[PDB]
Design a binder for this molecule. Structure first.
Ligand SMILES: [Zn+2]
Ligand SMILES: [Zn+2]
Ligand SMILES: [Zn+2]
Ligand SMILES: [Zn+2]
Lengths: 70, 66
DNA sequence: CCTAACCCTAACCCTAAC
DNA sequence: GGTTAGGGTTAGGGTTAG
């Protein structure tokens, strides 16, 4: 049947797999108003804001996402 | 009472020993099976292996840290 | 807290030169 | 021939995001 990729589980339907491997990736849902960087956690955005507190024109590169676990 | 591990100092409360373990500079716990260099981070070992593939006979010396 | 990864920099090595 | 300094190389660690 439908096989996944990130971890490898035998699934039934194609719609039961999207809701599964969709939560496998953290969604970027928190945007910095200063530099437009979108974060996966609110804590990451707060911690980020503590940088603009002491750096002019800070605009960091968008890093690769890291796979979650389930 | 409970003693330490890395250095091995005598410690009373456990929280003190924890926050002491937090600050220890260079803990080399990532060893290269190819040449023996003990790296302080895994990423440094990943960076080392690439050198171990660029050339053959490579056995560097354990540096003094900062 | 952890780690990953960029990145600058000190520590290293080899050797020419003094 | 001891000893030092220069240029290429590599590991240490600061920093910051996932
Ligand atoms: Zn999966
Ligand atoms: Zn920002
Ligand atoms: Zn210790
Ligand atoms: Zn090695």
């Amino acid at each position: 049947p439908h096989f996944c990729q990130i971890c490898g589980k035998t699934f039934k339907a194609v719609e039961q797999l999207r809701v599964h491997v969709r939560r496998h990736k953290g969604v970027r849902k928190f945007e910095c108003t200063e530099c437009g960087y979108k974060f996966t956690r609110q804590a990451h955005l707060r911690r980020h804001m503590e940088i603009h507190d002491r750096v002019e024109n800070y605009n960091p590169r968008q890093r690769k996402l890291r796979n979650l676990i389930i």
